[PDB]
Design a protein around this ligand. Structure first.
Ligand code: HEM
Length: 451
Protein backbone atom coordinates (compact mmCIF):
# COMPACT_ATOMS: atom_id res chain seq x y z
CA UNK A 1 0.00 0.00 0.00
CA UNK A 2 0.91 3.71 -0.26
CA UNK A 3 4.36 3.76 1.45
CA UNK A 4 6.23 6.86 2.61
CA UNK A 5 9.33 7.26 0.45
CA UNK A 6 12.70 7.02 2.25
CA UNK A 7 14.80 10.15 2.27
CA UNK A 8 18.14 11.09 3.69
CA UNK A 9 18.28 13.84 6.36
CA UNK A 10 17.38 17.39 5.26
CA UNK A 11 18.92 20.56 6.59
CA UNK A 12 16.23 23.24 6.53
CA UNK A 13 16.46 25.07 3.15
CA UNK A 14 19.68 23.27 2.14
CA UNK A 15 17.45 20.20 1.75
CA UNK A 16 19.63 17.11 1.14
CA UNK A 17 22.44 19.09 -0.50
CA UNK A 18 25.07 19.13 2.33
CA UNK A 19 25.20 15.33 1.81
CA UNK A 20 26.49 15.73 -1.75
CA UNK A 21 29.36 18.17 -1.15
CA UNK A 22 31.86 16.08 -3.08
CA UNK A 23 33.65 15.52 -6.42
CA UNK A 24 32.37 11.94 -6.35
CA UNK A 25 28.58 12.42 -6.25
CA UNK A 26 27.68 9.03 -7.81
CA UNK A 27 29.85 7.15 -5.28
CA UNK A 28 28.33 9.20 -2.45
CA UNK A 29 24.85 8.33 -3.73
CA UNK A 30 25.74 4.63 -3.68
CA UNK A 31 26.54 5.07 0.03
CA UNK A 32 23.10 6.59 0.66
CA UNK A 33 21.61 3.70 -1.35
CA UNK A 34 23.26 1.05 0.85
CA UNK A 35 21.82 2.95 3.84
CA UNK A 36 18.24 3.45 2.64
CA UNK A 37 17.79 0.70 0.03
CA UNK A 38 16.15 0.43 -3.43
CA UNK A 39 14.50 3.91 -3.47
CA UNK A 40 15.10 7.26 -1.90
CA UNK A 41 13.91 10.78 -2.68
CA UNK A 42 16.60 13.47 -2.89
CA UNK A 43 15.99 17.20 -2.78
CA UNK A 44 18.13 20.18 -3.64
CA UNK A 45 16.86 23.78 -3.62
CA UNK A 46 14.27 24.01 -6.41
CA UNK A 47 14.73 20.39 -7.60
CA UNK A 48 13.78 16.83 -6.59
CA UNK A 49 14.51 13.33 -7.86
CA UNK A 50 14.05 9.69 -6.82
CA UNK A 51 17.05 7.27 -6.85
CA UNK A 52 16.22 3.63 -7.68
CA UNK A 53 18.67 0.78 -7.05
CA UNK A 54 16.71 -2.50 -7.34
CA UNK A 55 15.90 -4.63 -10.31
CA UNK A 56 12.21 -4.84 -9.28
CA UNK A 57 11.75 -1.02 -9.35
CA UNK A 58 14.03 -0.37 -12.34
CA UNK A 59 12.12 -3.04 -14.34
CA UNK A 60 8.98 -0.85 -13.90
CA UNK A 61 10.77 2.42 -14.63
CA UNK A 62 11.97 0.91 -17.89
CA UNK A 63 8.36 0.48 -19.10
CA UNK A 64 8.44 3.13 -21.93
CA UNK A 65 4.61 3.30 -21.98
CA UNK A 66 4.82 4.85 -18.52
CA UNK A 67 8.20 6.59 -18.35
CA UNK A 68 10.34 8.30 -20.98
CA UNK A 69 13.98 9.52 -20.97
CA UNK A 70 14.51 12.61 -18.88
CA UNK A 71 17.28 15.20 -19.13
CA UNK A 72 18.86 15.29 -15.65
CA UNK A 73 20.23 18.67 -14.60
CA UNK A 74 23.60 17.25 -15.68
CA UNK A 75 22.42 16.55 -19.23
CA UNK A 76 20.70 19.97 -19.22
CA UNK A 77 24.11 21.52 -18.58
CA UNK A 78 25.63 19.43 -21.42
CA UNK A 79 22.73 20.32 -23.74
CA UNK A 80 24.31 23.80 -23.50
CA UNK A 81 26.86 22.43 -26.00
CA UNK A 82 25.47 19.13 -27.43
CA UNK A 83 22.05 20.70 -28.12
CA UNK A 84 19.39 18.44 -29.60
CA UNK A 85 21.77 15.75 -30.83
CA UNK A 86 20.97 12.13 -30.02
CA UNK A 87 22.12 12.17 -26.40
CA UNK A 88 20.62 15.50 -25.17
CA UNK A 89 17.35 15.56 -27.16
CA UNK A 90 13.95 14.80 -25.59
CA UNK A 91 12.24 11.79 -27.27
CA UNK A 92 9.34 14.05 -28.24
CA UNK A 93 11.71 16.46 -30.05
CA UNK A 94 11.51 16.28 -33.84
CA UNK A 95 15.25 15.70 -34.34
CA UNK A 96 15.43 12.73 -31.95
CA UNK A 97 13.50 10.14 -34.03
CA UNK A 98 14.76 11.74 -37.26
CA UNK A 99 18.54 11.60 -36.37
CA UNK A 100 17.90 8.11 -34.87
CA UNK A 101 16.48 6.82 -38.19
CA UNK A 102 19.08 8.69 -40.24
CA UNK A 103 22.07 7.55 -38.13
CA UNK A 104 21.11 3.96 -37.21
CA UNK A 105 22.43 2.35 -40.46
CA UNK A 106 25.94 3.47 -39.42
CA UNK A 107 25.80 0.85 -36.63
CA UNK A 108 24.58 -2.09 -38.76
CA UNK A 109 26.81 -5.20 -38.77
CA UNK A 110 27.35 -4.44 -42.43
CA UNK A 111 28.84 -1.04 -41.36
CA UNK A 112 30.54 -2.60 -38.32
CA UNK A 113 32.51 -4.95 -40.61
CA UNK A 114 33.62 -1.91 -42.63
CA UNK A 115 34.93 -0.17 -39.48
CA UNK A 116 37.08 -3.11 -38.40
CA UNK A 117 40.19 -2.16 -40.49
CA UNK A 118 40.23 1.44 -39.25
CA UNK A 119 39.91 0.09 -35.67
CA UNK A 120 42.97 -2.11 -36.19
CA UNK A 121 44.93 0.89 -37.52
CA UNK A 122 44.53 2.71 -34.18
CA UNK A 123 44.97 -0.54 -32.12
CA UNK A 124 48.34 -1.18 -33.80
CA UNK A 125 49.45 2.40 -33.10
CA UNK A 126 48.66 1.68 -29.44
CA UNK A 127 50.54 -1.64 -29.35
CA UNK A 128 53.46 0.08 -31.08
CA UNK A 129 53.64 2.83 -28.52
CA UNK A 130 53.88 0.23 -25.78
CA UNK A 131 56.35 -1.96 -27.76
CA UNK A 132 58.60 1.19 -28.03
CA UNK A 133 58.69 2.18 -24.32
CA UNK A 134 62.09 1.84 -22.55
CA UNK A 135 62.50 -0.43 -19.54
CA UNK A 136 62.48 2.44 -17.02
CA UNK A 137 59.05 3.37 -18.36
CA UNK A 138 55.35 2.87 -17.57
CA UNK A 139 51.93 3.32 -19.20
CA UNK A 140 49.28 5.88 -18.18
CA UNK A 141 46.20 3.79 -18.82
CA UNK A 142 43.14 6.07 -18.95
CA UNK A 143 45.26 8.53 -21.01
CA UNK A 144 46.30 6.05 -23.69
CA UNK A 145 42.85 4.41 -23.78
CA UNK A 146 41.51 7.90 -24.50
CA UNK A 147 44.03 8.34 -27.32
CA UNK A 148 42.70 5.08 -28.83
CA UNK A 149 38.97 5.74 -28.47
CA UNK A 150 39.04 9.40 -29.60
CA UNK A 151 41.13 8.46 -32.64
CA UNK A 152 38.90 5.46 -33.43
CA UNK A 153 35.66 7.46 -33.51
CA UNK A 154 37.44 10.21 -35.50
CA UNK A 155 38.51 7.77 -38.20
CA UNK A 156 35.50 5.43 -38.25
CA UNK A 157 32.90 8.13 -37.87
CA UNK A 158 34.37 11.13 -39.70
CA UNK A 159 37.52 10.04 -41.55
CA UNK A 160 39.51 12.50 -39.42
CA UNK A 161 42.91 11.70 -37.91
CA UNK A 162 43.29 13.22 -34.41
CA UNK A 163 46.75 11.72 -34.32
CA UNK A 164 46.46 11.45 -30.53
CA UNK A 165 49.49 9.17 -30.36
CA UNK A 166 51.77 11.94 -31.85
CA UNK A 167 51.18 14.07 -28.72
CA UNK A 168 52.63 13.42 -25.25
CA UNK A 169 49.84 15.52 -23.62
CA UNK A 170 46.04 15.10 -24.21
CA UNK A 171 44.63 16.41 -27.51
CA UNK A 172 43.27 19.99 -27.06
CA UNK A 173 39.65 18.73 -27.55
CA UNK A 174 40.03 16.27 -24.62
CA UNK A 175 41.26 18.99 -22.15
CA UNK A 176 38.25 21.21 -22.93
CA UNK A 177 35.78 18.30 -22.91
CA UNK A 178 37.03 17.19 -19.46
CA UNK A 179 36.97 20.68 -17.96
CA UNK A 180 33.43 21.25 -19.34
CA UNK A 181 32.11 17.86 -18.05
CA UNK A 182 33.61 18.58 -14.62
CA UNK A 183 31.87 21.98 -14.57
CA UNK A 184 28.44 20.56 -15.47
CA UNK A 185 29.12 18.24 -12.51
CA UNK A 186 30.25 21.10 -10.15
CA UNK A 187 27.13 23.16 -11.21
CA UNK A 188 24.80 20.52 -9.65
CA UNK A 189 25.97 21.03 -6.00
CA UNK A 190 25.56 24.84 -6.01
CA UNK A 191 22.50 26.06 -4.06
CA UNK A 192 22.52 29.51 -5.73
CA UNK A 193 26.18 34.16 -7.80
CA UNK A 194 29.04 36.42 -9.06
CA UNK A 195 31.44 33.95 -7.34
CA UNK A 196 30.99 31.63 -10.36
CA UNK A 197 31.65 34.20 -13.13
CA UNK A 198 35.05 32.71 -14.06
CA UNK A 199 33.67 29.14 -14.09
CA UNK A 200 30.98 30.40 -16.57
CA UNK A 201 33.66 32.09 -18.71
CA UNK A 202 36.00 29.06 -18.80
CA UNK A 203 32.85 27.03 -19.61
CA UNK A 204 32.21 29.16 -22.76
CA UNK A 205 35.90 28.89 -23.68
CA UNK A 206 35.81 25.07 -23.30
CA UNK A 207 32.77 24.98 -25.61
CA UNK A 208 34.54 27.06 -28.35
CA UNK A 209 37.60 24.77 -28.29
CA UNK A 210 35.30 21.74 -28.97
CA UNK A 211 33.46 23.57 -31.70
CA UNK A 212 36.74 24.52 -33.36
CA UNK A 213 37.32 20.88 -34.14
CA UNK A 214 33.76 20.63 -35.58
CA UNK A 215 34.52 23.24 -38.24
CA UNK A 216 37.85 21.54 -38.92
CA UNK A 217 35.99 18.18 -39.60
CA UNK A 218 33.15 19.89 -41.52
CA UNK A 219 35.69 21.72 -43.72
CA UNK A 220 37.73 18.50 -44.21
CA UNK A 221 34.82 16.43 -45.65
CA UNK A 222 33.90 19.58 -47.59
CA UNK A 223 37.22 20.30 -49.28
CA UNK A 224 37.43 16.82 -50.96
CA UNK A 225 33.17 7.89 -47.83
CA UNK A 226 30.17 6.06 -46.39
CA UNK A 227 30.14 6.69 -42.67
CA UNK A 228 28.43 8.57 -39.89
CA UNK A 229 29.40 11.91 -41.43
CA UNK A 230 28.00 10.78 -44.79
CA UNK A 231 24.56 9.92 -43.38
CA UNK A 232 24.54 13.13 -41.36
CA UNK A 233 25.10 15.05 -44.63
CA UNK A 234 23.05 13.02 -47.15
CA UNK A 235 20.65 10.90 -45.14
CA UNK A 236 16.93 11.41 -45.02
CA UNK A 237 14.47 10.22 -42.41
CA UNK A 238 12.33 7.42 -44.00
CA UNK A 239 9.26 8.88 -42.31
CA UNK A 240 9.17 12.62 -42.78
CA UNK A 241 11.51 12.60 -45.76
CA UNK A 242 13.64 15.32 -44.20
CA UNK A 243 17.38 15.58 -43.67
CA UNK A 244 19.13 17.15 -40.70
CA UNK A 245 19.69 20.90 -40.91
CA UNK A 246 23.22 22.28 -40.48
CA UNK A 247 22.65 23.24 -36.84
CA UNK A 248 21.62 19.77 -35.79
CA UNK A 249 24.50 18.14 -37.71
CA UNK A 250 27.00 20.16 -35.66
CA UNK A 251 25.27 18.96 -32.52
CA UNK A 252 25.69 15.38 -33.79
CA UNK A 253 29.38 15.76 -34.56
CA UNK A 254 29.95 17.00 -30.98
CA UNK A 255 27.66 14.33 -29.48
CA UNK A 256 29.61 11.53 -31.22
CA UNK A 257 33.10 12.80 -30.53
CA UNK A 258 32.38 12.89 -26.82
CA UNK A 259 29.95 9.95 -26.21
CA UNK A 260 31.65 8.09 -29.07
CA UNK A 261 34.92 7.61 -27.08
CA UNK A 262 34.89 8.56 -23.33
CA UNK A 263 32.83 5.71 -21.80
CA UNK A 264 34.72 3.18 -23.96
CA UNK A 265 38.02 4.51 -22.63
CA UNK A 266 36.78 4.18 -19.03
CA UNK A 267 35.68 0.58 -19.75
CA UNK A 268 39.10 -0.44 -21.08
CA UNK A 269 40.81 1.21 -18.07
CA UNK A 270 38.56 -0.63 -15.51
CA UNK A 271 38.83 -3.96 -17.40
CA UNK A 272 42.64 -3.74 -17.37
CA UNK A 273 42.47 -2.65 -13.69
CA UNK A 274 40.41 -5.72 -12.71
CA UNK A 275 42.63 -8.03 -14.76
CA UNK A 276 45.87 -7.03 -13.04
CA UNK A 277 44.05 -7.35 -9.65
CA UNK A 278 42.64 -10.78 -10.50
CA UNK A 279 45.57 -12.75 -11.90
CA UNK A 280 43.63 -16.06 -12.42
CA UNK A 281 41.21 -14.12 -14.64
CA UNK A 282 44.08 -12.43 -16.50
CA UNK A 283 45.83 -15.72 -17.25
CA UNK A 284 42.62 -17.17 -18.65
CA UNK A 285 41.81 -14.08 -20.75
CA UNK A 286 45.45 -14.11 -21.92
CA UNK A 287 45.07 -17.83 -22.89
CA UNK A 288 42.03 -16.98 -25.05
CA UNK A 289 43.85 -14.16 -26.87
CA UNK A 290 46.92 -16.28 -27.80
CA UNK A 291 44.73 -19.10 -29.10
CA UNK A 292 42.19 -17.05 -31.06
CA UNK A 293 44.35 -14.31 -32.54
CA UNK A 294 46.64 -16.57 -34.59
CA UNK A 295 47.20 -13.82 -37.23
CA UNK A 296 49.59 -10.86 -37.14
CA UNK A 297 46.52 -8.62 -37.05
CA UNK A 298 43.03 -9.65 -35.86
CA UNK A 299 40.19 -10.37 -38.27
CA UNK A 300 36.56 -9.36 -37.76
CA UNK A 301 35.47 -12.98 -36.99
CA UNK A 302 38.36 -13.53 -34.55
CA UNK A 303 37.12 -10.58 -32.49
CA UNK A 304 33.72 -12.31 -32.42
CA UNK A 305 35.49 -15.46 -31.12
CA UNK A 306 37.00 -13.62 -28.08
CA UNK A 307 34.22 -14.85 -25.78
CA UNK A 308 35.96 -14.63 -22.43
CA UNK A 309 37.40 -11.17 -23.30
CA UNK A 310 33.69 -10.12 -23.84
CA UNK A 311 32.80 -11.62 -20.43
CA UNK A 312 35.60 -9.55 -18.80
CA UNK A 313 34.20 -6.40 -20.54
CA UNK A 314 30.65 -7.06 -19.34
CA UNK A 315 31.76 -7.84 -15.77
CA UNK A 316 33.73 -4.57 -15.68
CA UNK A 317 30.55 -2.72 -16.84
CA UNK A 318 28.61 -4.50 -14.09
CA UNK A 319 30.96 -3.17 -11.40
CA UNK A 320 31.70 0.22 -12.91
CA UNK A 321 29.22 1.18 -15.70
CA UNK A 322 31.08 4.11 -17.28
CA UNK A 323 27.89 6.14 -17.83
CA UNK A 324 26.76 5.42 -14.27
CA UNK A 325 23.24 6.95 -14.47
CA UNK A 326 20.22 7.65 -16.66
CA UNK A 327 17.13 9.64 -15.86
CA UNK A 328 13.42 9.07 -16.56
CA UNK A 329 10.19 11.02 -16.04
CA UNK A 330 6.56 9.95 -15.52
CA UNK A 331 4.58 10.41 -18.75
CA UNK A 332 1.41 10.48 -16.63
CA UNK A 333 0.36 10.08 -13.01
CA UNK A 334 1.20 6.50 -11.99
CA UNK A 335 2.01 4.20 -9.06
CA UNK A 336 5.59 2.80 -8.85
CA UNK A 337 6.17 -0.64 -7.27
CA UNK A 338 2.52 -0.67 -6.23
CA UNK A 339 3.41 1.71 -3.37
CA UNK A 340 4.86 5.00 -4.63
CA UNK A 341 2.32 7.32 -6.27
CA UNK A 342 3.99 9.58 -8.80
CA UNK A 343 2.86 12.72 -10.61
CA UNK A 344 3.11 13.49 -14.31
CA UNK A 345 6.60 14.95 -14.75
CA UNK A 346 8.26 13.44 -11.65
CA UNK A 347 11.89 12.41 -12.19
CA UNK A 348 13.58 9.04 -11.48
CA UNK A 349 17.31 8.34 -11.59
CA UNK A 350 18.71 4.87 -12.27
CA UNK A 351 21.79 4.28 -10.21
CA UNK A 352 23.32 1.57 -12.41
CA UNK A 353 26.20 0.59 -10.11
CA UNK A 354 23.63 -0.15 -7.35
CA UNK A 355 21.42 -2.04 -9.78
CA UNK A 356 24.44 -4.18 -10.71
CA UNK A 357 24.95 -4.99 -6.99
CA UNK A 358 21.35 -6.20 -6.38
CA UNK A 359 22.03 -9.33 -4.35
CA UNK A 360 18.55 -10.76 -4.98
CA UNK A 361 19.66 -10.97 -8.64
CA UNK A 362 23.43 -11.46 -8.53
CA UNK A 363 23.96 -13.39 -5.22
CA UNK A 364 26.10 -12.31 -2.21
CA UNK A 365 29.47 -11.71 -3.88
CA UNK A 366 28.65 -8.64 -5.98
CA UNK A 367 31.99 -6.91 -5.31
CA UNK A 368 33.98 -9.83 -6.75
CA UNK A 369 35.29 -9.70 -10.31
CA UNK A 370 33.96 -12.87 -11.96
CA UNK A 371 33.59 -12.71 -15.77
CA UNK A 372 32.10 -16.28 -15.60
CA UNK A 373 28.82 -14.70 -14.32
CA UNK A 374 28.16 -13.97 -18.01
CA UNK A 375 28.76 -17.56 -19.17
CA UNK A 376 25.23 -17.81 -20.53
CA UNK A 377 23.75 -14.28 -20.48
CA UNK A 378 20.18 -15.33 -21.37
CA UNK A 379 20.19 -16.72 -17.79
CA UNK A 380 20.50 -13.16 -16.37
CA UNK A 381 17.05 -11.67 -15.59
CA UNK A 382 15.68 -8.80 -17.73
CA UNK A 383 16.62 -5.29 -16.65
CA UNK A 384 19.25 -6.64 -14.23
CA UNK A 385 22.14 -5.54 -16.44
CA UNK A 386 21.77 -2.06 -18.01
CA UNK A 387 25.17 -0.40 -18.73
CA UNK A 388 23.69 0.90 -22.06
CA UNK A 389 20.42 2.41 -20.90
CA UNK A 390 16.96 1.35 -21.88
CA UNK A 391 14.57 0.90 -24.80
CA UNK A 392 14.51 3.24 -27.77
CA UNK A 393 16.83 5.58 -25.84
CA UNK A 394 19.43 2.86 -25.26
CA UNK A 395 23.02 3.39 -26.46
CA UNK A 396 23.19 3.43 -30.26
CA UNK A 397 26.93 2.76 -30.09
CA UNK A 398 26.79 -0.39 -27.97
CA UNK A 399 28.16 -2.90 -30.51
CA UNK A 400 30.69 -0.36 -31.87
CA UNK A 401 32.06 0.11 -28.29
CA UNK A 402 32.22 -3.61 -27.54
CA UNK A 403 33.82 -4.45 -30.87
CA UNK A 404 36.47 -1.77 -30.27
CA UNK A 405 37.07 -2.86 -26.67
CA UNK A 406 37.25 -6.62 -27.35
CA UNK A 407 39.64 -6.08 -30.28
CA UNK A 408 41.89 -3.80 -28.27
CA UNK A 409 41.92 -5.86 -25.04
CA UNK A 410 42.53 -9.03 -27.11
CA UNK A 411 45.62 -7.43 -28.74
CA UNK A 412 46.87 -6.12 -25.37
CA UNK A 413 46.61 -9.56 -23.81
CA UNK A 414 48.32 -11.20 -26.79
CA UNK A 415 51.21 -8.74 -26.95
CA UNK A 416 52.23 -7.97 -23.33
CA UNK A 417 52.39 -9.12 -19.73
CA UNK A 418 51.18 -6.39 -17.42
CA UNK A 419 52.62 -5.44 -14.08
CA UNK A 420 50.72 -3.55 -11.37
CA UNK A 421 54.05 -2.00 -10.34
CA UNK A 422 52.74 0.69 -7.95
CA UNK A 423 50.18 -1.65 -6.35
CA UNK A 424 47.52 0.78 -7.67
CA UNK A 425 44.74 1.80 -5.30
CA UNK A 426 41.40 2.29 -7.16
CA UNK A 427 40.44 5.98 -7.33
CA UNK A 428 37.42 6.69 -9.47
CA UNK A 429 37.17 10.16 -11.01
CA UNK A 430 33.68 11.48 -11.91
CA UNK A 431 33.14 13.91 -14.76
CA UNK A 432 29.61 12.69 -14.87
CA UNK A 433 31.21 9.55 -16.43
CA UNK A 434 33.64 7.24 -14.50
CA UNK A 435 37.33 6.35 -14.98
CA UNK A 436 40.10 5.03 -12.72
CA UNK A 437 42.24 8.15 -12.20
CA UNK A 438 46.01 7.59 -12.03
CA UNK A 439 45.89 3.95 -13.13
CA UNK A 440 49.40 3.02 -14.33
CA UNK A 441 51.06 -0.26 -15.32
CA UNK A 442 54.16 -1.72 -16.87
CA UNK A 443 53.81 -3.83 -19.99
CA UNK A 444 56.53 -6.31 -20.89
CA UNK A 445 56.35 -7.17 -24.57
CA UNK A 446 55.99 -10.87 -25.42
CA UNK A 447 57.97 -9.85 -28.54
CA UNK A 448 55.29 -10.97 -31.00
CA UNK A 449 55.28 -9.23 -34.43
CA UNK A 450 52.43 -7.08 -35.81
CA UNK A 451 51.11 -7.23 -39.41
C1 HEM B 1 31.18 1.04 -22.94
C2 HEM B 1 30.87 2.06 -23.73
C3 HEM B 1 29.53 2.84 -23.65
C4 HEM B 1 28.64 2.94 -22.63
C5 HEM B 1 28.69 2.26 -21.24
C6 HEM B 1 27.56 3.79 -23.06
C7 HEM B 1 26.42 4.14 -22.33
C8 HEM B 1 25.28 4.78 -22.79
C9 HEM B 1 24.09 5.07 -21.99
C10 HEM B 1 23.87 4.68 -20.52
C11 HEM B 1 23.21 5.75 -22.75
C12 HEM B 1 21.80 6.24 -22.31
C13 HEM B 1 21.84 7.62 -21.66
C14 HEM B 1 20.51 8.03 -21.04
O1 HEM B 1 19.54 7.23 -21.00
O2 HEM B 1 20.40 9.20 -20.57
C15 HEM B 1 23.81 5.89 -24.06
C16 HEM B 1 23.23 6.52 -25.15
C17 HEM B 1 23.89 6.94 -26.28
N1 HEM B 1 25.14 6.53 -26.69
FE1 HEM B 1 26.48 5.20 -25.57
N2 HEM B 1 27.85 4.24 -24.33
C18 HEM B 1 29.04 3.66 -24.74
C19 HEM B 1 29.63 3.85 -25.98
C20 HEM B 1 29.10 4.61 -27.01
C21 HEM B 1 29.64 4.74 -28.36
C22 HEM B 1 30.94 3.99 -28.80
C23 HEM B 1 28.85 5.61 -29.06
C24 HEM B 1 28.94 6.10 -30.55
C25 HEM B 1 29.78 5.52 -31.43
C26 HEM B 1 27.76 6.03 -28.18
C27 HEM B 1 26.74 6.91 -28.53
C28 HEM B 1 25.55 7.14 -27.88
C29 HEM B 1 24.50 8.02 -28.31
C30 HEM B 1 24.44 8.93 -29.55
C31 HEM B 1 23.40 7.88 -27.26
C32 HEM B 1 22.04 8.59 -27.28
C33 HEM B 1 21.15 7.55 -27.98
C34 HEM B 1 19.74 8.09 -28.15
O3 HEM B 1 19.13 8.55 -27.14
O4 HEM B 1 19.22 8.07 -29.30
N3 HEM B 1 27.93 5.39 -26.95
N4 HEM B 1 25.08 5.29 -24.06
Amino acid sequence: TIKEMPQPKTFGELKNLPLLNTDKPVQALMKIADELGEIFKFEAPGRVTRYLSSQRLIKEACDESRFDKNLSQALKFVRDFAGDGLFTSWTHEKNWKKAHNILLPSFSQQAMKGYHAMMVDIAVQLVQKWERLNADEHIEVPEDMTRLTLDTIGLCGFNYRFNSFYRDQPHPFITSMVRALDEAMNKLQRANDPAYDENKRQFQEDIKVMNDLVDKIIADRKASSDDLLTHMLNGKDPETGEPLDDENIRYQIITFLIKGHETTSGLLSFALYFLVKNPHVLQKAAEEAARVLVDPVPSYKQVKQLKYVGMVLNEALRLWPTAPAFSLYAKEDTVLGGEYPLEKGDELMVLIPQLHRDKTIWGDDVEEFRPERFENPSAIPQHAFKPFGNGQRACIGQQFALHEATLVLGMMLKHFDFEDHTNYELDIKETLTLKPEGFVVKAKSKKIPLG
